[PDB]
Ligand SMILES: [Cl-]
């Protein structure tokens with residue numbers, strides 16, 4: 001299992017594991033902050049190990065970039081390492097309340113291998129600190145901004161921004177070598193959210209998965225790609241709705257435009273059915289995402305195949 005621990009700047013690191021989402025790490029004067037937890041407390045052990053190869057400081061703050069189980073269910077591992085708060089936006093908190101249980105069951109059923117040692121998961125991760133717009137932590141002298149600048153990947157998407165070093169942890173708002181999972185997306189709002197991230201002027205950006213982007217040209221390529229992906233996806237959904245297509249026809253129409261431009265990115269085929277399904281709903285006027293459950297997955301595959 002290939003693990004990559006990348007020092008991005010004086011105080012910022014990215015943690016990547018083959019096939020897993022990225023986690024972000026900020027080492028402040030007094031304490032460590034992480035962005036997303038890895039999928040289980042058993043998997044969190046190796047992120048802790050990487051952090052402890054650098055510092056003995058308490059892992060005081062655990063930020064959830066959004067509510068999805070793979071991002072949050074490792075949170076309880078960090079208590080013994082010094083966690084004082086699990087931080088989430090109001091939107092993320094609302095999603096945990098509304099569909100945390102359903103999403104936990106859904107994600108573990110879909111991709112059990114993402115949840116190594118799933119028996120170590122104690123239950124849902126409940127934030128202890130919920131913010132509306134923006135909080136700033138001073139880790140000694142190090143300023144860390146935790147911000148909701150708009151929704152996209154989910155209602156409540158949260159970013160972590162290190163202004164002094166221009167390091168942005170985008171959660172799943174930004175991708176580059178992988179497709180966007182849009183099953184819970186607010187597709188209409190995502191382009192404006194991407195432009196808000198562009199206005200930050202990041203020199204380093206940790207995307208949802210894959211290697212970090214290490215200069216502004218790479219940052220903007222990731223922003224442009226993600227914007228193109230989610231704009232095209234929603235546009236094809238509006239076309240399917242205008243034409244009264246069923247889901248199989250909507251998938252074929254979406255592929256017309258998405259496959260040439262994006263068909264090469266990692267996990268494209270895994271994500272595309274959920275993306276077409278969400279785009280069709282949202283274009284149909286379902287602004288708040290339907291909840292994904294096993295029976296909805298089953299009906300989706302049935303509609304797409306036979
Ligand atoms: Cl606030």
Ligand SMILES: [Cl-]
Pocket residue numbers: 290296
């Ligand atoms: Cl449904």
Ligand SMILES: [Zn+2]
Pocket residue numbers: 066068071153172181
């Ligand atoms: Zn996600």
